Design a protein around this nucleic acid. Structure first.
Ligand SMILES: [Mg+2]
Ligand SMILES: [Mg+2]
Ligand SMILES: [Mg+2]
Ligand SMILES: [Mg+2]
Ligand SMILES: [Mg+2]
Ligand SMILES: [Mg+2]
Ligand SMILES: [Mg+2]
Ligand SMILES: [Mg+2]
Ligand SMILES: [Mg+2]
Ligand SMILES: [Mg+2]
Ligand SMILES: [Mg+2]
Ligand SMILES: [Mg+2]
Ligand SMILES: [Mg+2]
Ligand SMILES: [Mg+2]
Ligand SMILES: [Mg+2]
Ligand SMILES: [Mg+2]
Ligand SMILES: [Mg+2]
Ligand SMILES: [Mg+2]
Ligand SMILES: [Mg+2]
Ligand SMILES: [Mg+2]
Ligand SMILES: [Mg+2]
Ligand SMILES: [Zn+2]
Ligand SMILES: [Zn+2]
Lengths: 102, 129, 81, 25, 229, 130
RNA sequence: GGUGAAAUUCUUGGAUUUAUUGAAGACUAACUACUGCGAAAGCAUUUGCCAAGGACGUUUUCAUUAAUCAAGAACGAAAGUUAGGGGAUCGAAGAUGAUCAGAUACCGUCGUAGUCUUAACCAUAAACUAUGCCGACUAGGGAUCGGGUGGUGUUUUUCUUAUGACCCACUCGGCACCUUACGAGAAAUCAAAGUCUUUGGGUUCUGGGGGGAGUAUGGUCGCAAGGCUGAAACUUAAAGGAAUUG
């Protein structure tokens, strides 16, 4: 039975797509069906900014952020809670989960 | 400027090891090469944040006895193909450098990132833990 | 729209529809009487002229062709046919 | 079996049969 | 600790003694085009007859933040690599080697729903410095767009990059190292690129990255002293 | 834990719907009222009825609540609804005796062929980022 | 080093890191999306050559030259095969280090063939949209890509025209998407899977219960692997689809 209309892959008109490797289990998966997450974080946590700020020669220096895109395999992500099973009627809600920070 | 003696921290943190290693501005010659895994024995906690913190305290003491006063932060991950994320211990290493007297400036990340250049360990189906 | 007069629909509607799809096929392009800055010669030019039409007497680019409707020179003046 | 494996086992049996046929001829 | 086999391919006692007492410091000075000319202080093993300390010194490379040599914080993202070539004794003098962005700004400028433009050029300077210069640009959302994306057609990219090539070649082939650096520090090349490319496509975050040196001619001491003090 | 299950709610709602004018604020008064105007087998049940009816009295004196609809509150609805300003908001009075509109509706008015005081003023076609 | 843990393995001839450099092959990250092109496989650093193409515009030209197609052909992922050049990573076989009752499996180190190329083969994939192609009609909604139209449109600026980039409206063509059924289906669902008992627009190719079996045999292609074509005896009362409740 057709689980999804878009086949849960999102190509529809390219025949084939270059595959990219998972960051957790190193699985090769097509880039479209690769459930990607941009992890923008600081080099230090919120519990360390104080010590670095008081141990800094520059008074107004703002610590820079680390950027990287994460390409998961699907199984690791279902395991690592970043992607969640849904009820059948709620599968089709394409919009990203509504921001809790309202 | 009160003539701070500047260096770079060159913190290298894998998931299995943490490297706190200060060197001069040029980076050619190496003041302190105490390793995070050195400070522990279990060999499973080489990258544990406590080990990095203790190695970092060792580095700070070595710097203050050498004459190093300020350090630039060089956080590094494994880079290449293995991973793109900082090691779990390097963060505590940076914290320990922070709260240890030495002055800090110019924190940045120097993770070597490839332009999708080579095959990655694991095969097609990858790790099957 | 169960009842409407397809035989004589409103003129704005036919002008809106694509050509080759109106009630009777009729092209939208036209011809133009263009006057060159140089002489008083008047020359007829197609709207979407494909070649660089020039005055027979003197070599001047009256129109510069483009994808659709040809582009007239700045000095030349045009009148709808 | 998986149909894949059934096909592979049949292919190996065909290979052995062809080897026997070549030996006989 | 001591998870070791000590499979060494042997003395009773090894005299590590003092490695740092046989070491001396040396102050680094930047080319005059940088404002805060004093750089820092590097350590090195003391001189011996067989091997000159200055020999080991000439060839060193030092990374600095541009804001440290400027004083302003409008240049915290840049990264200048200088080259140790000549030493005056307890003080060493350096020549320009290269430029870079800290990775942070680099990944910051690369956002989604906008196509970046990467251009490269290889070019000889006025005197002999064979350089390679990179150029990054980002297509800008108009101040009126409802179009969520701001992608640019490949023809726009190609014309833009041809313009970039022309501008960079014109700028480099004329001027020397000192003039080139004095141009880069206010990044007026960025303004010139923006002005030229504003006719083709609206452009944003244009910068000049990774000023990479390929070849340098035979050293001239008088020029180095000219760049200093 | 005291949640006053289905039966007391239903009884109280029906009593207020039917007997609004003869219920008071005091608990014991409502207890005797519910004693006389309702057949209740056990005294504890009637006590609960009285308690939740007193709660409803306090609610209704605060303000009208949902579900319940007695005839008297329709009179409060009549008073509030029947109020009306003497001068209309629409009758070409406010905004200095000017009906401020754009050209297209002016053409509408002219095409209908009736005399209306207009004040034509075009609106900029500009659409902001919103 | 490596892991859930470890060990195989490398190391004071100083490994791992640190800096510079250089060599060799690989790939083209981030950009990169319900976005583009191609017949399909596939296609992603730059710019120069070479030819090709879709779409649009066309008061340009020929006047049925058309659609689908047994026969025959051209391409045809990856793996594989020959020979020759490469030889980094990765890595079937293997070598091993561990778990396990067993583990020549999952995990860890190495590691040939291949992985990359130049000629020649192979012609198979869940080569999937599991929807043949060409036509006409049937219902609304925005977006998106390319083209063309108009805007006294908005900024731009070279004083301003003209651009370009955008905003609005429409149109042609394309990947799709959203809601709905008024029709369809056994439904899951479909705007084609509709216009099919009120059964007929033109066309190729397949299937007739499940196994036996894509097997035997016979042809033919191929160096080989194998491909194409392709049964029956016998046996069985189900196999299977979709959804429903547990
Ligand atoms: Mg299923
Ligand atoms: Mg297509
Ligand atoms: Mg699993
Ligand atoms: Mg393995
Ligand atoms: Mg070493
Ligand atoms: Mg790229
Ligand atoms: Mg594109
Ligand atoms: Mg045929
Ligand atoms: Mg191949
Ligand atoms: Mg070979
Ligand atoms: Mg094995
Ligand atoms: Mg074994
Ligand atoms: Mg290996
Ligand atoms: Mg097939
Ligand atoms: Mg098929
Ligand atoms: Mg097909
Ligand atoms: Mg049968
Ligand atoms: Mg079968
Ligand atoms: Mg045969
Ligand atoms: Mg099936
Ligand atoms: Mg079922
Ligand atoms: Zn994974
Ligand atoms: Zn003329």
């Amino acid at each position: 039975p057709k689980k999804r209309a878009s086949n849960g892959r999102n190509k529809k008109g390219r025949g084939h797509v270059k595959p990219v490797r998972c960051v957790n289990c190193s699985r090769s998966v097509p880039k479209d069906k690769a459930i990607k997450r941009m992890a923008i974080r600081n080099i230090v946590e919120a519990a360390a900014i104080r010590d670095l700020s008081e141990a800094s020669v520059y008074a107004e220096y703002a610590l820079p952020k680390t950027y990287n895109k994460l390409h998961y395999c699907i199984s690791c992500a279902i395991h690592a809670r970043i992607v969640r099973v849904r009820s059948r009627t709620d599968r089709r809600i394409r919009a990203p989960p509504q921001r809790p920070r309202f | 400027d009160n003539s701070q003696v500047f260096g770079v921290a060159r913190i290298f943190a894998s998931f299995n090891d943490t490297f706190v290693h200060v060197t001069d501005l040029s980076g050619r010659e190496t003041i302190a090469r105490v390793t995070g895994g050195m400070k522990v024995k279990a060999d499973r906690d080489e990258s544990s944040p406590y080990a990095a913190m203790l190695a970092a305290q060792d580095v700070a003491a070595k710097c203050k006895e050498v004459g190093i006063t300020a350090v630039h932060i060089k956080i590094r991950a494994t880079g290449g193909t293995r991973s793109k994320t900082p090691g779990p211990g390097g963060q505590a290493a940076l914290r320990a450098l922070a709260r240890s007297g030495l002055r800090i400036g110019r924190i940045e990340d120097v993770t070597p990132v490839p332009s999708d250049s080579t095959r990655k360990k694991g095969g097609r189906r990858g790790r099957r833990l | 729209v169960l009842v409407q007069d397809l035989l004589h629909p409103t003129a704005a509607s036919e002008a809106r529809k694509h050509k080759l799809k109106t009630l009777v096929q009729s092209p939208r392009s036209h011809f133009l009487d263009v006057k060159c800055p140089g002489c008083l010669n008047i020359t007829t030019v197609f709207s979407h002229a494909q070649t660089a039409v020039t005055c027979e007497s003197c070599s001047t680019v009256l129109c510069t062709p483009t994808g659709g409707k040809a582009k007239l020179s700045e000095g030349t003046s045009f009148r709808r046919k | 079996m998986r149909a894949k494996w059934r096909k592979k086992r049949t292919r190996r049996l065909k290979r052995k049969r062809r080897k026997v046929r070549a030996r006989s001829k | 600790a001591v998870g070791k086999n000590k499979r060494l391919s042997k003395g009773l006692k090894k005299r590590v003694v003092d490695p740092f007492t046989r070491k001396e410091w040396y102050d680094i000075k930047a080319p005059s085009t940088f404002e805060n000319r004093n750089v820092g202080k590097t350590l090195v093993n003391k001189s011996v007859g067989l091997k000159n300390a200055s020999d080991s010194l000439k060839g060193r490379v030092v990374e600095v933040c541009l804001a440290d040599l400027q004083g302003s914080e409008d240049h915290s993202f840049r990264k200048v690599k200088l080259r140790v070539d000549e030493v005056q004794g307890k003080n060493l003098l350096t020549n320009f080697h290269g430029m870079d962005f800290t990775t942070d700004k680099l990944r910051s400028m690369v956002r989604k729903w906008q196509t970046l433009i990467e251009a490269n050029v290889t070019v000889k300077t006025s005197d002999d410095y064979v350089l390679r210069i990179f150029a990054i640009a980002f297509t800008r959302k108009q101040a009126n767009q409802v179009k969520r994306t701001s992608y640019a057609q490949s023809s726009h990219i190609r014309q833009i990059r041809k313009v970039i090539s022309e501008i960079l070649t014109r700028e480099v082939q004329n001027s020397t190292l000192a003039q080139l650096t004095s141009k880069l520090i206010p990044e007026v090349i960025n303004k010139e690129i923006e002005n030229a490319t504003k006719d083709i496509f609206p452009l944003q975050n244009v910068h000049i990255r990774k000023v990479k040196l390929l070849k340098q001619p035979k050293f001239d001491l008088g020029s180095l002293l000219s760049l200093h003090g | 834990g005291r949640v006053r299950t289905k039966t007391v709610k239903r009884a109280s709602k029906a009593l207020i719907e039917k007997y609004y004018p003869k219920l008071t604020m005091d608990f014991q008064t409502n207890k005797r009222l519910c004693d006389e105007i309702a057949t209740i087998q056990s005294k504890r049940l009637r006590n609960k009825i009285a308690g939740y009816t007193t709660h409803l009295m306090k609610r209704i004196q605060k303000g009208p609540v949902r579900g319940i609809s007695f005839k008297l509150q329709e009179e409060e609805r009549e008073r509030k609804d029947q109020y009306v300003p003497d001068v209309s908001a629409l009758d070409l009075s406010h905004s200095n005796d000017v009906l401020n509109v754009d050209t297209q509706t002016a053409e509408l008015v002219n095409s209908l062929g009736l005399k209306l005081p207009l004040s034509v003023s075009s609106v900029s076609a500009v659409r902001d980022r919103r």
